[PDB]
């Protein structure tokens, strides 16, 4: 029951946000592993789609772990929840793919925005901070290189030209 | 329906318990990654507990990645489920978690020999041979080493002794 | 008549399996040389499929050298046979060498799954581990590199698209 | 009484088999040191047959303790019983060393081969793997190399020709 | 049927003659690793010949791959037949496999002379230059080096003196 | 039955001693090896008693391989007999296992003074000068270096504190 020796300003709607929040993060690894191995299938074969995809899973596992980090360094108290599997196993295409993911991006974006308000609302200027300075700004990039990557593939001719996703491949992820 | 043109001596139930093992080696991943945060809590604060099962949480992610790029070579297609919370939030103690570790590793190893004895059954040489280089000897040394650590920290005195599992964080893991 | 000296647990069934294989490692050899320079044609004319043939090519050659090695380590004797000429002059198109060199690649991997099986029967766990350690996981990853040629060079419009076979020889073969 | 804490999969016949062999390795280890010290006696005199035969005694060493090493990783108990003296004090010549040291080491690679039979019918893959990774193919090399050299000792002219084990020391042990 | 765009002066009797001295060159590639993996048995054993006739087999393969490039260059078209087994499986001793050796190099000879003189009867001083550039003084150099070899081991004792044919194997072809 | 053309001043009865010494020596280098793989059991797990005790393992067996050195040096003939195993199976404790250590060292001093009494009554200075150069000064240092072991073990509370041996390993052997 008793109080961490460390936690000062940080109230218990905001422990469980951040809960919250890490689950998603690890929800978001996950649908970018299975996107990645997706473009590794011998009838899919685009080599630098798979590794793109794979360093995005990468990096949401390191943005899970630094909520994890934060939660014990206000004094709150990890719990974690099932990772659900994606919504996709078959993600059609290049240009689905990177459409899912320009649309999960922006679904976690909503999230930390949801996560400022709470902090806000209970003024946490440090929570507050933290967000703005490693997730915000972060989520703008990831949202604007997808869209761009979107907007190249549909110029190109994708998703029914397949020489436009196997030249993206090679110029924009190589 | 058709089938991939690359398969070639690769049962559907190799496929199958291909898949579960992904799931598994995932679920794995997951429980190192509850324990080291629970080493990073300020009331626990063991920080070479907390850097050793991050490490071996990383390498559980490599073991699936291994299994998803196994999978895509034979011409299977990976499915994907929930991966499951840990049983545990609280793991204890360093004795408690390193006996958990233990008990988790000789489960993934069941697995695997029961994979093995799958592919034995079906005459898949190629998959035997991938299970032995790449996974059976990886487990004896992981189960050996769990072994050694639940046994020196027995013998220092926890978990009763708070001065046994820090000064075995400083000599063993540090 | 006499036995080697060095002859122990090496059936005359898998002695004489050593040397079939030998003779269709050196057919392989030659199916790829003959792909190689099909491109060299002045009305062809892709530098990059050639030399990757011609290196497919020398690898089949080092694969029946190893079998040379193994036959003379375990104590048998080399019976060479006639190298046949390959099926094709003329291979018609990128996408279609890529094709036959799919289905020579899964001719030569059941071959040596015949020859696994062989060795199992016979106990010979020496000649199994050589087969696994030195074949099958290189006829694997062949197998699948081959399919992802041939995805790629199909969804890019081969062999009608000169183009597509033009831009692959550069960016996948280059 | 009571089981380790790592075993699993490891059959009590296993473990008995692994203590047979560690005493085997150690008797190959004393037979060449035999041989070797023969060599350096001021009426046989030839340094290069000492040094290989030496070298080889190192190598059973190394051998024994690596079985030592994975008896300990699978939780089984070793158990150590006398090292017999060599059969023989007078090795008589190049060649008849040469020609013992083929016998041993096919007596040995027998011994293993009974080994991998003991742990296939225990269905244990990872002993199996151990086996041939380890030990199966050192075994076929050695037994090659001594086979070539009892081959040239003979053709020389050994053991009548002194010359012909002189020049066999310098050449090809030297 | 249509003509090579790249095709002067280039007759269909030297295209041809061309198609036979690439089977000729395959040919003597086959007899050399059939020679060399004689060398390797456990009881021939000369390890210096079996290098010495692997490399023969590797320049005979050069020789072969520079017709093919000479074919295309000059616009004919490659038709490959099978490659004949060696006359011999057993080549009794390294002074018989030097002979045997002699005789197929002074055959391969004969014919580019065959070649020459059909090229300088066509007026194609391109190929007369091609062959005197790149095979008549390669030929020349083969056969005396071989007359050599066979010189010293006759003068040596070959092949009744088996120290005669490991002192060539160390000092001349090591 | 004649004489070693090198043999001067080397007694029959220094012979046979020397004979005794070696087999001695192997059978120290055999207790240190056994005690060695005792430290490496998963419920003793004390890496750095193991690695110390199989050092002593491997310097034993040059001790042995010196004096075998020395019988041919003076023209006697060397006479292996069986390699006894140890004494133990089980160690029961670092602490046991360095007392059982200073008793196997100072039993093997013991036989040393009694070949340097024989040596001096045989009025044999070289042997005299070989024990006291390569051998009774290593003994002295042996025996003290494990009676500071087993003092500090003692001292710290071994064999009842496992902290003790637990921190003798990493502080002095480590
Ligand atoms: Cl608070
Ligand atoms: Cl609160
Ligand atoms: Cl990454
Ligand atoms: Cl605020
Ligand atoms: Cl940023
Ligand atoms: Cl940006
Ligand atoms: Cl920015
Ligand atoms: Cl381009
Ligand atoms: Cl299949
Ligand atoms: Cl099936
Ligand atoms: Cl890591
Ligand atoms: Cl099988
Ligand atoms: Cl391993
Ligand atoms: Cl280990
Ligand atoms: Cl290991
Ligand atoms: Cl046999
Ligand atoms: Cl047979
Ligand atoms: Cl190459
Ligand atoms: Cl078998
Ligand atoms: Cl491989
Ligand atoms: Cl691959
Ligand atoms: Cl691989
Ligand atoms: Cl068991
Ligand atoms: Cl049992
Ligand atoms: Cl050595
Ligand atoms: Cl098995
Ligand atoms: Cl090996
Ligand atoms: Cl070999
Ligand atoms: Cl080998
Ligand atoms: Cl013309
Ligand atoms: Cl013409
Ligand atoms: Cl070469
Ligand atoms: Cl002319
Ligand atoms: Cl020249
Ligand atoms: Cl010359
Ligand atoms: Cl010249
Ligand atoms: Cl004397
Ligand atoms: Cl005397
Ligand atoms: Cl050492
Ligand atoms: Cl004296
Ligand atoms: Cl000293
Ligand atoms: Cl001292
Ligand atoms: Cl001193
Ligand atoms: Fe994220
Ligand atoms: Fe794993
Ligand atoms: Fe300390
Ligand atoms: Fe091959
Ligand atoms: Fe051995
Ligand atoms: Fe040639
Ligand atoms: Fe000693
Ligand atoms: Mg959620
Ligand atoms: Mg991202
Ligand atoms: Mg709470
Ligand atoms: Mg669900
Ligand atoms: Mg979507
Ligand atoms: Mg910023
Ligand atoms: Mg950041
Ligand atoms: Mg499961
Ligand atoms: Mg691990
Ligand atoms: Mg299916
Ligand atoms: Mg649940
Ligand atoms: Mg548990
Ligand atoms: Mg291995
Ligand atoms: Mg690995
Ligand atoms: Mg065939
Ligand atoms: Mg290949
Ligand atoms: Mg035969
Ligand atoms: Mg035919
Ligand atoms: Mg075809
Ligand atoms: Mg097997
Ligand atoms: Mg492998
Ligand atoms: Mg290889
Ligand atoms: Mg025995
Ligand atoms: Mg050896
Ligand atoms: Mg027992
Ligand atoms: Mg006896
Ligand atoms: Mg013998
Ligand atoms: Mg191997
Ligand atoms: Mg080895
Ligand atoms: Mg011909
Ligand atoms: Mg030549
Ligand atoms: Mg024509
Ligand atoms: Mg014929
Ligand atoms: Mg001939
Ligand atoms: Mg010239
Ligand atoms: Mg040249
Ligand atoms: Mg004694
Ligand atoms: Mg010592
Ligand atoms: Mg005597
Ligand atoms: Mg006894
Ligand atoms: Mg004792
Ligand atoms: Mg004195
Ligand atoms: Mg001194
Ligand atoms: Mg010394």
């Not at 899970?64 to 994606?86: C, H, T, V, Y």
């Not at 930390?112 to 703008?140: G, M, R, S, W």
Request: proline share 2%; aromatic share 10%.
């Amino acid at each position: 029951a008793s109080t961490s020796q460390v936690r000062q300003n940080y109230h218990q709607d905001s422990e469980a946000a951040i809960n919250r929040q890490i689950n998603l993060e690890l929800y978001a690894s996950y649908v970018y592993l299975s996107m990645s191995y997706y473009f590794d299938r011998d009838d899919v074969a685009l080599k630098n789609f798979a590794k793109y995809f794979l360093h995005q899973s990468h990096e949401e596992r390191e943005h899970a772990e630094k909520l994890m980090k934060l939660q014990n360094q206000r004094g709150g108290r990890i719990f974690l929840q099932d990772i659900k599997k994606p919504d996709c196993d078959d993600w059609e295409s290049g240009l689905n793919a990177m459409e899912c993911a320009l649309h999960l991006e922006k679904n976690v974006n909503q999230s930390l925005l949801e996560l400022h308000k709470l902090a806000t609302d209970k003024n946490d200027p440090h929570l507050c901070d933290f967000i703005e300075t490693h997730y915000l700004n972060e989520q703008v990039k990831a949202i604007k290189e997808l869209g761009d990557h979107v907007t190249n593939l549909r110029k190109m001719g994708a998703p029914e030209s397949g020489l436009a996703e196997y030249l993206f491949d090679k110029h924009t992820l190589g």
